[PDB]
Amino acid sequence: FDCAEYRSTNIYGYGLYEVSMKPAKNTGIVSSFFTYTGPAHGTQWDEIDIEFLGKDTTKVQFNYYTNGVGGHEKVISLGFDASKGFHTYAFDWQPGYIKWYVDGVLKHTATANIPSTPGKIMMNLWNGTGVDDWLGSYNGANPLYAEYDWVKYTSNASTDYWQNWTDGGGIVNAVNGSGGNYSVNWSNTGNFVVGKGWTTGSPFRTINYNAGVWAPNGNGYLTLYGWTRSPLIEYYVVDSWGTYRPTGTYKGTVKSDGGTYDIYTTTRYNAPSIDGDRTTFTQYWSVRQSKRPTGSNATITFSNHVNAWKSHGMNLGSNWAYQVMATEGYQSSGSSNVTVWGSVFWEPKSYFNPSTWEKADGYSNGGVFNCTWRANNVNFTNDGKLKLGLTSS
């Protein structure tokens, strides 16, 4: 028996691992997506799994090994047959937990003896021997296939600041979420500003976020927000908004991260600021000429804005205070869900890219794996999908 394993050439650490896949269906096999490192690579055996036991594809199995100790199996009922269509499975791996998801919904959290060694991303399909109680016995049916549409890994941002300010009008339910994530649900408010970011901003920072939810019902801004002191200046890089587009005195424009922004300035007197709730300071703005798409990864190269501002005579303070990816609102209702992240590894799997992936070939895992890995069983379909096969002879 011949089986298939596709594995990354690089190693990856803590962060969110997502895959879109359709597992094979048959007694005695497994289709999976997992991270792995072990003794053959000079490390302890640290692995995090997503496994579909072909005997019953209406279930998914989650597991993990740390220093070679597994025993963390959690089987969950899916509510659909995973073999009948593509679905997104994922696990967020951090030092104190692992959270697994199905089509974006949280289904299981683990906290005991979590792995810590960066591993490779892997995907395999195989038939077992000696584990009939676990997989059912394999009946030789072939060929069988497991398909994967895309793989994505996003590393941590290291945001250290949480901002949750409301003027007291209406309701602002802000949620300080895990890592760089936050969400806000608001109802008929006065003014507020909620966001995650950094305690000390920087003119060189590159902010990467994703707004999984951007649904202002009225005046809301999805915006890089921060301050400087010496002098006191509040700045904004607005990517999207609600029913009102912020403007002021026009200075010019700046092209950055695929968008063009209008640059403005506005002055403020007697309003809440970081140096006291009744002060006098300017606001610097970059406002996108049209709302940025949300729901996907977006980058704000803050230095291009700082520089274009410098160029139009707008210079910032030298005492840098907080810097966040915010949701601000006024006299409105809405929801927002935003994640600030570190870096993304994106693989569309449209074909075999030999710099970032390798096809296991010419050897068997032995043990319960009753098959040899073959690069010939790792192919790409026309519609740009990884197709893993289990064949015989």
**Residues of this chain, 30-49, that bind Ca ion according to CB under 5 A:** none
234 as an active site residue: the answer is yes
Pick the piece of the chain touching Ca ion (CB under 5 A) from 3-11, 150-158, 161-169, 196-204: 150-158
Number of chain positions touching a second copy (CB under 8 A) = 6
Stated as kind and residue range, the H or E segment containing 140 is: none
Task: Give, as one character, the DSSP assignment of residue 40.
Answer: G
Catalytic option among 5, 18, 328, 347: 328
Q: What residues from 170 to 209 belong to the interface with a second copy (CB under 8 A)? A: 199
Among positions 51, 149, 257, 347, the unique one binding Ca ion when judged by CB under 5 A: 149
For residue 167, count other CB atoms closer than 10 A to its CB: 14
Residue 296 interacting with a second copy (CB under 8 A): no
> Does 276 interact with a second copy (rule: CB under 8 A)?
yes
Which is nearer to a second copy, 111 or 296 (by Cβ)? 296
Piece of 164-172, 174-182, 283-291, 344-352 that binds Ca ion (CB under 5 A): 344-352
Here the tokens at position 129 are: 């021997």
Do the Cβ atoms of 265 and 235 come closer than 8 Å?
no
Name which position in 111, 270, 355, 393 contacts a second copy (CB under 8 A): 355
Tokens representing 255 are 């092209």
Q: Residue type at 19?
A: V
Nearer to a second copy, 178 or 311 (CB): 311
5 catalytic residue (yes or no): no
Q: Say which entry of a second copy, Ca ion, none residue 18 contacts (CB below 5 to 8 A, set by partner kind).
A: none
**For residue 4, what are its two tokens?**
């298939």
Contacts of 71 (CB under 8 A, 6+ apart): none
Torsion from C-alpha of 302, 307, 309, 310, nearest 10 degrees: 140
User: Binding pattern to Ca ion, positions 374-393, x when CB under 5 A?
Assistant: ----------xx--------
Given candidates 348, 367, 376, 381, which one binds Ca ion under the rule CB under 5 A? 348
C-alpha closest to that of 83 among 137, 29, 141, 122: 29
Give the one entry of Ca ion, a second copy, none that residue 275 binds, where binding means its C-beta sits below a cut-off of 5 to 8 angstroms depending on kind: a second copy
Neighbouring CB atoms inside 10 A of 161's CB total 16
* In the complex, least distance from residue 147 CB atom to Ca ion, rounded to whole angstroms: 9
Least distance between Ca ion and beta carbon 17 (Å): 16
- Is residue 230 at the binding interface for Ca ion, with CB under 5 A as the rule? no
Exactly one of 7, 349, 359, 374 binds Ca ion (CB under 5 A); that residue is 349
182 vs 180: CA distance, rounded Å: 7
Place of tokens 């594995």: 7
Out of 350, 364, 365, 379, the only residue in the binding site for a second copy (CB under 8 A) is 350
- Is residue 128 within 8 Å of 369, Cβ to Cβ? yes
CB of 150 to Ca ion, least distance (A): 5
Closest CA to 371 of 83, 138, 147: 138
Tokens coding 164: 């949750």
Within a 10 A sphere around the Cβ of 224, how many other Cβ atoms? 23
User: Is 328 annotated in the active site?
Assistant: yes
CA angle 126, 127, 129 (to 5 degrees): 135
Query: Of 5, 18, 147, 234, which residue is the catalytic one?
Result: 234
CA distance 176 to 54: 39
- Residue 228, token pair as written in the block: 């400087």
Stretch in the footprint of Ca ion (CB under 5 A) among 143-151, 189-197, 229-237, 261-269: 143-151
Cα gap 268→278, rounded to integer Å:
10
Task: Locate 361 and state its tokens.
Answer: 């070939």
Cβ nearer to a second copy, comparing 43 with 279: 279
**Beta partners for residue 147, in sequence order:** 22, 387
Instruction: Determine, following the binding rule CB under 5 A, whether residue 293 of this chain makes contact with Ca ion.
Output: no
Span of 182-190, 261-269, 347-355, 385-393 interacting with a second copy by CB under 8 A: 347-355
Give yes or no: 18 in active site. Answer: no
Q: How far is the CB of 203 from a second copy (least distance, A)?
A: 13
Q: Does 351 bind a second copy (CB under 8 A)?
A: yes
- Residue positions annotated with a catalytic role: 47, 51, 234, 328
Residues that bind a second copy (CB under 8 A): 199, 275-276, 350-351, 355
Residues that bind Ca ion (CB under 5 A): 149-150, 348-349, 384-385
